[PDB]
Amino acid sequence: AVKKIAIFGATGQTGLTTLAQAVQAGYEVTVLVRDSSRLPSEGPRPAHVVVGDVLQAADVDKTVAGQDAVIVLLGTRNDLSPTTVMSEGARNIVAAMKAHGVDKVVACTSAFLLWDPTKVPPRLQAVTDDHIRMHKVLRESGLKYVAVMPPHIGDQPLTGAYTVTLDGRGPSRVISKHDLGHFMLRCLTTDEYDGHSTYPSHQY
Ligand SMILES: NC(=O)c1ccc[n+]([C@@H]2O[C@H](COP(=O)([O-])OP(=O)(O)OC[C@H]3O[C@@H](n4cnc5c(N)ncnc54)[C@H](OP(=O)(O)O)[C@@H]3O)[C@@H](O)[C@H]2O)c1
Numbered sequence: 001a002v003k004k005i006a007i008f009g010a011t012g013q014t015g016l017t018t019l020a021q022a023v024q025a026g027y028e029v030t031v032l033v034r035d036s037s038r039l040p041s042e043g044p045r046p047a048h049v050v051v052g053d054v055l056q057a058a059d060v061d062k063t064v065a066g067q068d069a070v071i072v073l074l075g076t077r078n079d080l081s082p083t084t085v086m087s088e089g090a091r092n093i094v095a096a097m098k099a100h101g102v103d104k105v106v107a108c109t110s111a112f113l114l115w116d117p118t119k120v121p122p123r124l125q126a127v128t129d130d131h132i133r134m135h136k137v138l139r140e141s142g143l144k145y146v147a148v149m150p151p152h153i154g155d156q157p158l159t160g161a162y163t164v165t166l167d168g169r170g171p172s173r174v175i176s177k178h179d180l181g182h183f184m185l186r187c188l189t190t191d192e193y194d195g196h197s198t199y200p201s202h203q204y
């Protein structure tokens with residue numbers, strides 16, 4: 001079973017609760033972060049910290065070495081500008097996984113990849129464009145890839161009661177950050193989502 005994981009984006013909104021739940025679950029967690037100051041100083045903390053940039057292949061290589069699986073929660077925080085950080089990060093992550101023989105990656109993009117493209121809000125298109133590029137990188141990689149495509153990420157509590165919809169849109173348009181992280185970790189315990197798109201959603 002999976003015991004050692006790397007989490008990219010561990011200091012973000014979803015990352016921080018995914019890191020907490022993973023350490024609570026008994027995972028040996030490695031994180032790549034841009035500043036150790038953005039990690040929690042008390043509470044569940046990672047067993048291993050690499051400080052650097054997902055845009056530096058050497059930094060990604062050090063993080064992926066020795067792991068059983070990888071979680072990707074990269075994002076742009078509040079910035080809606082055009083960007084390639086997530087898709088270039090993903091190229092580095094895939095390269096490292098292949099060099100080291102890590103075969104399992106669970107990666108968050110967005111449910112807009114399952115929407116009619118004329119319906120995606122133009123204000124969000126620039127970020128969505130790189131979500132599409134990142135999904136393409138991971139799809140084409142040949143790795144065991146679970147594409148997690150959430151709708152709106154909220155701040156409702158952990159429930160573990162969300163619906164998981166495969167290869168399509170689900171019945172609710174929100175998922176709490178805690179349940180999204182919970183789902184990311186569930187994907188490490190099973191191969192039944194490999195190669196599929198996954199839409200977690202719930203009514204709070
Ligand atoms: N907001 C929504 O409703 C919504 C809906 C659907 C999908 N999504 C997508 O879900 C994903 C995660 O959402 P989120 O809000 O939890 O992400 P987030 O709060 O924006 O956190 C982004 C993470 O990416 C890391 N990161 C960014 N650039 C990096 C770089 N060059 N090198 C290393 N690390 C880097 C950040 O590290 P730092 O701490 O150093 O900044 C941070 O940990 C995002 O891709 C988002 O677009 C969001």
Ligand SMILES: CCc1c(-c2ccccc2)nn2c(=O)cc(-c3cccc(C(=O)O)c3)[nH]c12
Pocket residue numbers: 076077078079080110111112124127128150151152153173
């Ligand atoms: C593109 C990511 C994003 C962001 C964002 C935030 C900060 C910086 C950059 C981007 N905010 N944000 C939302 O508020 C809602 C959705 C979303 C996705 C899919 C389906 C639905 C739905 O309504 O069904 C909603 N995506 C989203």
